[PDB]
Write a protein that binds this ligand. Structure first.
Ligand SMILES: NC(=O)c1ccc[n+]([C@@H]2O[C@H](COP(=O)([O-])OP(=O)(O)OC[C@H]3O[C@@H](n4cnc5c(N)ncnc54)[C@H](O)[C@@H]3O)[C@@H](O)[C@H]2O)c1
Ligand SMILES: NC(=O)c1ccc[n+]([C@@H]2O[C@H](COP(=O)([O-])OP(=O)(O)OC[C@H]3O[C@@H](n4cnc5c(N)ncnc54)[C@H](O)[C@@H]3O)[C@@H](O)[C@H]2O)c1
Lengths: 481, 481
């Protein structure tokens, strides 16, 4: 028997108790979603992403399938059972649940900026309110769930963009175009995300900035919620790649192993071969070097993947190593063997038959450092592909960018009031102010209606209706152009 | 129809390519799940938790509903479509998917230690292997998903127990029993987890040590996967509690608002009131004090909640403060107002009508410091409830306890071989060594069989049937007794 988590209990327990605590005559509760701070250096804007997936998944699909379409008695019973046995209330009140189910839709209105927009720290990006006085309580009820579902997709998108930002600049600095950047950020993180759902949301954020990923469910997530179709557009893509357990199973005859892989198993196209199973630098000096003709013969690219050592020292060289190959580093050594071309900016790019990827403990600062030292050696940034892992995408909180749902506005017996402690007060809008986006708050309903044409927040969901349906392609256009 | 993420594509992209890479005649792959290191100080053991949930959710239900019970052609086509348009293969080989579907079950054997067991760092807790040679590739394939799903529930379960370990120990020292500890750890973290699924996994981990939670989905998760039932056992419990937005809506006549909350809205039972919306110490010194008789007349408890300042200094006092109230802190001031009882060992316990809860930026170290500084002034540790939030449960990685899944053993054309990079080699077992769980590795099948008796890993899932079905009550008794 399939277990249904009631749509009316996807919250903190105390959310259930707030309805009775509001003042009598409360008709409206209005709350905003804001990144209040940044804990990541050089990042003062966040990449708005994730509202549509949450709205389609939970407010439309989940509530319709598991609440509104079901018998009224069943949703009432499921709510009463949990309240009765967890709050020790002998006879829980569910008349409001009855009334919501009889209404037949969620009486809320959600506005949000376009997904893909850069939002400065301390500028709200989404608002939610109730559209019928009787359900003043619904807004606050949903807050927990919304926060639970939308802070990770934005965080990942933002972090992903930072890599992208670095990689774009260096590309323009060292190549003069960014054509290779889409594949330079490669999601490796799925095994280290905390759940398949978190995997999907984080990986979708990654796919806003890059097309390279190993997180298959992220590609399909964009198919499910952002109208993507892999048959018509590059959502994500990846390459055949070996792994340490397979490398160890095949044995120590690394010449024959590599030769079989690149001449027989993958005679053409891309193939990534992890090379540090037994001795990395020996593999470069003795296997790859001996395979030069075969590598140059394939219509494709053999990508070398180290998976240990210091990323910067392995890629760019260790200046204090006695050994020449260790001193030079992978990119220079592969250049020495295979050569390549010179870009319009005077930088060296590897011959397209050989390549490099590094995906162990990659961080934003290490990506920046690798690009910087490579450029100092005359090598373009596009010579390395960065495997961006769970250290980047999992190791955050919702306070990494200071996100919070805050009630800022309420109507009680027709009286407008501002909600705060001691920050945003009253109704809010975000307007183009010169070349920046600016918060406007302390608005009453009249002033807010006046500003509506200038508010870059758009109606996204009212009363069960989806009002805006963005595509992955549209969001990528907004973000990167 | 609704979007199906194919059961055969919940993995890193390169896992798809590994099948054709193994040596010819590979017949068995055997992998272990191990916490290889600890990044949390004073935590050298991990609380095994989550395997049963993952197996039930994905290995049984997801593969049955979305792969086996569906027509062969559909599951072949979905896989082919993704592989074609993401790996640039014009005709992907799906014969192995077809063969798995024809088999009708997962030819898989998973063994694990009992959930609730303390596992030392660097000792494996779970193994996985294929039961039919042709499906050697399935073990590797499942690796990613299983990791993605089982590191968080264990990590949370371990972190929660850390709090438990402290709260038990101070309880024994200050009161002489642990009767209060079950509610002293209260999960507040839902809005800050990265997804609702991660919320369920983490909160389920929290509920092994405590019964206090605001995470309703975690209680229901234990109902879904761990045979719990809130009608017959105490799975999780909570209380009515106010929030800043509610308090602000009710206005600054705080005496009237508090009095209505405790005499009319919640005349009995527990009720938590957040008291720092405008001035925390004025509320304590003016509102709570003036409500002393009403508070004492209720059949229940009023729980004061601060949500700002330094947690240690608010609870135990700021010794550098000039104001009596601030220097003494919440617990001593509440004692001055209401008094209470004195334990056998000389420690003060607040009158049962009044209480304290703190749930902002709570850490293990802060919990310990608050217990220590309360005891240093003769206050029992049971006087305050700890609201453990997303800072604790979200801000981790898989490598917080060094979790990795590594193939350690393979059979190739009948020959047993060890797998390891340059660590566990071969088949493994975990034996009790005088209440010291130790790893035994480098075992061939014969040696592993001779050790079957002393191996604490038990059969959990073989060839489609769940063989061990632990209850939440069993796990709690194993953990705490
Ligand atoms: N197609 C492919 O080749 C492919 C696909 C997927 C994964 N992979 C590989 O699998 C691994 C991915 O695993 P990942 O993304 O979880 O690791 P990661 O590379 O993102 O980071 C793991 C390392 O970062 C540090 N780290 C992580 N958590 C930390 C913490 N709390 N505190 C301090 N340091 C911490 C540690 O040094 C850790 O070893 C990688 O080795 C990847 O290359 C490869
Ligand atoms: N029944 C109830 O009263 C109830 C229930 C649920 C939640 N709540 C309240 O809602 C809030 C829960 O929020 P939470 O659990 O996500 O946060 P938390 O209270 O566990 O921690 C928040 C603080 O921890 C620090 N933090 C978080 N991430 C950080 C990071 N990357 N780096 C450095 N510091 C970081 C910060 O100081 C942050 O302000 C709390 O205020 C809680 O009291 C109350």
């Amino acid at each position: 028997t399939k277990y249904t988590y009631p749509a009316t209990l996807l919250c903190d327990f105390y959310k259930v108790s707030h309805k009775e605590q509001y003042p009598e005559g409360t008709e409206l509760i209005y709350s905003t979603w804001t990144p209040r701070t940044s804990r990541v250096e050089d990042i003062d804007r966040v990449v708005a992403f994730g509202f549509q997936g949450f709205i389609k998944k939970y407010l439309i699909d989940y509530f319709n399938e598991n609440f509104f379409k079901r018998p009224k008695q069943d949703v009432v019973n499921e709510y009463k059972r949990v309240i009765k046995h967890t709050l020790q209330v002998d006879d829980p009140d569910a008349s409001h649940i009855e009334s919501l189910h009889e209404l037949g839709y969620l009486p809320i209105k959600i506005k949000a900026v376009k997904e893909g927009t850069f939002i400065p720290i301390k500028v709200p990006m989404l608002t939610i309110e109730n559209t019928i006085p009787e359900f003043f309580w619904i807004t606050n009820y949903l807050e927990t769930l919304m926060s639970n579902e939308i802070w990770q997709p934005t965080t990942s998108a933002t972090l992903a963009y930072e890599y992208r930002k670095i990689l774009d600049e260096y590309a323009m600095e060292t190549v003069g175009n960014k054509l290779a950047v889409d594949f330079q950020g490669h999601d490796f993180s799925m095994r280290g995300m905390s759940s398949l759902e978190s995997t999907k949301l984080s990986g979708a954020g990654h796919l806003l900035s890059f097309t390279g990923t190993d997180t298959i469910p992220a590609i399909l997530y964009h198919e499910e919620f952002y109208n993507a179709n892999i048959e018509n557009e590059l959502v994500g893509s990846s390459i055949p790649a070996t792994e340490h357990s397979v490398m160890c199973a095949n044995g120590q005859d690394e010449y024959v192993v590599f030769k079989k892989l690149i001449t027989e198993t993958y005679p053409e196209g891309f193939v990534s071969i992890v090379s540090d199973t037994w001795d990395f630098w020996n593999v470069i000096d003795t296997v790859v070097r001996k395979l030069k003709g075969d590598i140059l013969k394939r219509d494709g690219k053999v990508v070398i993947r180290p998976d240990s050592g210091d990323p910067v020292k392995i890629i760019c060289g260790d200046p204090e190593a006695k050994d020449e190959l260790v001193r030079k580093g992978l990119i220079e050594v592969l250049w020495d063997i295979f050569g390549g071309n010179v870009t319009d900016k005077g930088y060296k790019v590897l011959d397209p038959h050989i390549g490099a990827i590094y995906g162990d403990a990659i961080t934003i600062s290490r990506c920046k450092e690798i690009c910087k030292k490579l450029a100092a050696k005359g090598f373009a940034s596009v010579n390395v592909v960065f495997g961006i892992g769970s250290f980047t995408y999992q190791y955050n909180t919702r306070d990494t960018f200071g996100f919070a749902m805050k009630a800022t506005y309420t109507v009680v017996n027709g009286e407008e009031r501002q909600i705060f402690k001691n920050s945003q007060k009253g109704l809010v809008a975000v307007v183009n102010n010169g070349n920046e986006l600016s918060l406007v708050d302390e608005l009453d309903r009249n002033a807010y209606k006046q500003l509506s044409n200038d508010d870059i927040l758009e109606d996204v969901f009212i009363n069960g209706q989806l009002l805006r349906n963005q595509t992955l392609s549209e969001i990528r256009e907004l973000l990167l152009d």
